[PDB]
């Protein structure tokens, strides 16, 4: 009958126009068993029409940034092309009860032109550190366990 | 790109064993247009195996408690019988931007025997007034717009 995880987010780029979108999050384990991140997806929703987005992981507290944390951008439907999410997944990682996974990184357009973050569902302004944020979502084996999908 | 509603809940019965479960909630309108409650469902998740549950509305800030606010209990699946939700719906009601709908009431077993709230997903303890509560859900035309379903 208990939730066993919560998510916090902090976005270092709070200007509306930015070359990088920061999806940094912390998944907190609030239950009594380990959480297997191999079954966990996290989504950052954004609106943008540039096809070639690059994904960079700057920090992963539970493993190797290059090898263990993966990112891919998906369209929400065939139409319209601009409504997307980045989905972050893990090849390895286990969150101890009472602990948290810290995962920091960015996405950028391959041509280094700027995003307009103003219309991005997951965009968080006005805070100065990691805060619970219900506009990014978390799934465990494809069940939605945290957050609100765009509507 | 914005959420337009949030939910707060307060449960006046915080004893684990209780003859009444209080589902009281406030839906806040955080956007710029009216919210039509005719398209809104709110769910309180609980585990209980008594078939005949009665629903009482004590306060509805936007209309008539008897006629305008409706409640029905549903099973989450055929199996297991005990995992349920109360769904609250509205025949009438429109939340002004910047305002909130207050909706207080209870469910009871028709035989007046006690619930055990300890295993109820939506059960909230340790608070002294209405607080944002992400273990009750809200839907607008069947899209989930607030909260986390049991998992
Ligand atoms: Ca955008
Ligand atoms: Ca129960
Ligand atoms: Cl909980
Ligand atoms: Cl916070
Ligand atoms: Cl949604
Ligand atoms: Cl928002
Ligand atoms: Cl609160
Ligand atoms: Cl769920």
Beta-carbon separation of A144 and B140 below 8 A: no
Q: Quick one: fold of B1-151?
A: Immunoglobulin-like (2.60.40)
Domain ranges across chain B:
1-151
Q: What does the radius of gyration of chain B's CA atoms come to, in whole angstroms?
A: 15
CA distances from A120 to A127, B2, B31, B37 (A): 16, 9, 16, 27
Tokens 């509205």 belong to residue:
B90
CB pair distance less than 8 Å for B1 and A119: yes
Copy the structure tokens of residue B74.
């549903």
Q: Which residue has the tokens 């940034």?
A: A65
Of B1, B121, B146, the CB nearest to A1: B121
User: Do residues B70 and B56 lie in contact, with contact meaning Cβ atoms separated by under 8 Å?
Assistant: no
Put simply, whether A31 touches B (Cβ < 8 Å) is no
Q: Please name which of A126, A122, A125, A117 lies closest in space to residue A150, comparing C-alpha atoms.
A: A122
CA distance B67 to A139: 39
| CB proximity A140 to B under 8 Å | yes
Give me the resolution in angstroms, 1 decimal: 1.9
Q: How many C-beta atoms lie closer than 10 Å to residue A43's C-beta?
A: 24
Inter-chain CB proximity A148 and B150 less than 8 Å:
no
SS3 label, residue B128: coil
What kind of experiment solved this structure?
A: X-ray
Cα within 13 Å of Cα(B85), Cβ side: 20
Cβ–Cβ contact A33 with B under 8 A = no
Residue B146 sits at the chain A interface (C-beta within 8 Å) = yes
Give the number of beta-carbon pairs within 8 Å between A and B: 36
Using alpha carbons only, give the angle B6, B91, B60 rounded to the nearest 5 degrees: 55
Say how far residue A23 (Cα) sits from the centre of its chain.
Answer: 5
Helices (H) and strands (E) in chain B, counts: 1, 15
Chain A residue with Cα closest to B1: A121
* A102, HSE (Cβ side, Cα atoms, 13 Å): 7
| Nearest CB partner across the interface for B135, out of A3, A120, A150 | A3
Nearest one of A46, A67, A44, A55 to A110, comparing CA atoms = A55
Tokens 């219900």 locate to A134
Q: Which residue of B has its CA nearest to A118?
A: B1
Exposure on the CB side of residue A23, measured as CA atoms within 13 A: 31
Cβ(A140)–Cβ(A6) below 8 Å:
no
- Looking up tokens 């987005």 gives A53
């Amino acid at each position: 009958s208990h939730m066993i995880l919560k998510l916090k987010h902090y976005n270092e780029q709070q200007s509306l126009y930015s070359k990088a979108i920061r999806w940094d999050f912390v998944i907190e384990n609030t239950g009594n068993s380990y959480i297997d991140l191999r079954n966990v997806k996290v989504r950052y929703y954004f609106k943008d029409d540039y096809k070639n987005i690059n994904f960079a992981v700057y920090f992963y507290s539970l493993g190797d940034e290059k090898n263990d944390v993966k990112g891919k951008v998906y369209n929400i439907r065939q139409s319209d092309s601009s409504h997307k999410y980045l989905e972050v997944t893990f090849e390895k990682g286990s969150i101890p009860p009472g602990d948290a996974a810290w995962v920091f990184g960015a996405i950028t357009r391959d041509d280094w032109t700027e995003f307009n973050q103003e219309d991005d569902w997951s965009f968080l302004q006005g805070n100065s550190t990691f805060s619970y944020w219900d506009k990014m979502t978390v799934y465990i084996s494809d069940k939605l366990v945290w957050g609100i999908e765009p509507y």
